[PDB]
Write a protein that binds this ligand. Sequence first.
Ligand SMILES: Nc1ncnc2c1ncn2[C@@H]1O[C@H](COP(=O)(O)OP(=O)(O)O)[C@@H](O)[C@H]1O
Ligand SMILES: Nc1ncnc2c1ncn2[C@@H]1O[C@H](COP(=O)(O)OP(=O)(O)O)[C@@H](O)[C@H]1O
Ligand SMILES: [Mg+2]
Ligand SMILES: [Mg+2]
Lengths: 365, 328
Amino acid sequence: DEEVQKEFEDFWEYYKSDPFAGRNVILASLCPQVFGMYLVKLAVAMVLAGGIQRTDATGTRVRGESHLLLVGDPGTGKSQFLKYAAKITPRSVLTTGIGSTSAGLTVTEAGALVLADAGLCCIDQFNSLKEHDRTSIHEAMEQQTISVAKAGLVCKLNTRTTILAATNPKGQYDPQESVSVNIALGSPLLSRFDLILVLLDTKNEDWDRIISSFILENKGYPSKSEKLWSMEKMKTYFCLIRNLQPTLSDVGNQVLLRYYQMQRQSDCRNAARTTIRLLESLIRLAEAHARLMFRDTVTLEDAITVVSVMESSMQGGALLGGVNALHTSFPENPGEQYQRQCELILEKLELQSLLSEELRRLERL
Amino acid sequence: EFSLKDLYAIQEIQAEENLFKLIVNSLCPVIFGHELVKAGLALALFGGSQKYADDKNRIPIRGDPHILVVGDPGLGKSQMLQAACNVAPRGVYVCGNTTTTSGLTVTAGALVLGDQGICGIDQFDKMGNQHQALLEAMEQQSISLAKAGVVCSLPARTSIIAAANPVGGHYNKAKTVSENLKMGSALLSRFDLVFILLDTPNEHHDHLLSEHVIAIRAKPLSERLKVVPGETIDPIPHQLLRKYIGYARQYVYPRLSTEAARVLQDFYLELRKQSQRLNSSPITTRQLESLIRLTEARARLELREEATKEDAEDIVEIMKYSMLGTYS
Ligand SMILES: Nc1ncnc2c1ncn2[C@@H]1O[C@H](COP(=O)(O)OP(=O)(O)O)[C@@H](O)[C@H]1O
Ligand SMILES: Nc1ncnc2c1ncn2[C@@H]1O[C@H](COP(=O)(O)OP(=O)(O)O)[C@@H](O)[C@H]1O
Ligand SMILES: [Mg+2]
Ligand SMILES: [Mg+2]
């Protein structure tokens, strides 16, 4: 039907002078029952967008999806995101985790990962997921296929899913003692996860009052303006942008290629988030932000947007600094913030020959 | 459907002067004392309201409380619950030794049969493996299939009321609260009120209690409910009290008023700023929702649709019996 394409073209033709206003309006409707929390509501869109599969000729096939994990103190909104993201996507199977047996996480009969082909399998309560079962998913998380020869049958099945998980920080959380210590998960497992966003509750006297007024006054959607969006429209949007096939560029790759080389050895290179599986994710994330904005050519803007988010993802050790996810609000104007971010990033990792061109493009726009 | 005489009886009961005393002192008349503990069960029997805000997506929030009672043995914390289960449109009583994970949950579990009612569980402490099996049912307000989680969900609306004993039999008075209960910070925050009862050898209380038990076999919100001897407080029969909750639960939906919300906001902002430095159970945003859910409850007992300042002044005194008032 041409009506849907016409309406979406009108929407992303009106917002031509300001390109980031459209993305802000897109993000505002994701889980509109919560207040603020910018980065958390931004990472879910990238995770839900997806990627592109690239299979070699003879035998091999690399992954083309993404995964996410959230850790935070009780009472922050983790379950709301899972429940809301289990509805927008066409096919989803919501599990309990510790309440789910081995018959679901693997093959038996079809379980959960196999039953969620081309979908998204929400998983909750990942802290004590039956260690045998919690480790029998390494093969199904990185190769997108199962390989079992139980009872001498030799059966092979396909399973391509995006996994969302949320686990409590068992033991009082500490700013130091990186998640490998606080959560006590093996290094092999804590490497396939793309973004590990940490949620921490602190001492403030303004967010408390704002959220108290929000809950007490029952003000649904404090932005009383009637823009919003219905769930059907968002479902159509996230089922229609999954057909475009973006291609890389030259003002693009170089930034990520230099960032990885710089990050590989600064002084600590953390302990597990500096492997080759970093450059295989810094591309699958940058190729999703070019599908959320109705185009098929990755440019400097997408690279900067993904680099900032990914650098903020790594808690503690970083190369600019860490910002808490909870205490964030939508900026009043995104254009100036993007202009400042580009100038900040393109200086210390040297590609100043591109800063002048980007400024020339921005001025003439 | 209710008969005409049923409506006449309900209207007559509504006309009583002190409608809170005649309900908080008639749930179980054998037990002497424990006014606030019985008031908690009286509030929990009615419940609150269900919010379907943002009907495009909703993601509904539960509208019923959860009460846990922990104290020394011999106090009588097993007959306040029998009467509570008996006086209910639909109830069920299950022990904590003969039931497993497949018992409480679907395999039709105890929770499913307690739909729109009470599923009071005794001997909560003895459970050691089924603790992590009801955190989903209590919060999500729904339960899925227990066979590899292949969809097939079914509603499960319960108002779990549990009673348990400390780990060391008698609870001694020089330790920390967290190690005398053997509970994590996840299962100790879902419950709305966690009463702690002690057994101390007073003089007047024992002299009255012994007289009461020998006779049987032959202002703050703690004194206005007490009965001064020399008057008649003749209780409503449980048969008539069972046909009042049903009318109250499907013909009135309370809502908050602008005057009441200010007190709750002030109390929340006072609790947080003080207990964020001291050591106690962390106050999440759940308590602000809990105060609303309980203040709505004290508007379905008197058969009204409002929340006056006086009504919101009662979930402030009953709340300071498991929080700050008791943490010391
Ligand atoms: N920003 C917010 N606005 C309104 N309610 C919130 C907000 N953040 C958290 N909540 C409340 O917290 C609850 C979420 O609990 P959650 O932290 O997901 O449980 P768990 O710790 O088991 O993951 C919701 O019921 C919601 O009402
Ligand atoms: N205030 C009271 N008046 C009369 N009898 C009481 C009172 N308190 C406790 N009892 C007696 O205690 C018994 C209940 O024991 P209970 O404390 O429920 O056991 P447990 O501690 O294992 O739950 C009843 O038989 C009752 O006669
Ligand atoms: Mg949860
Ligand atoms: Mg008992």
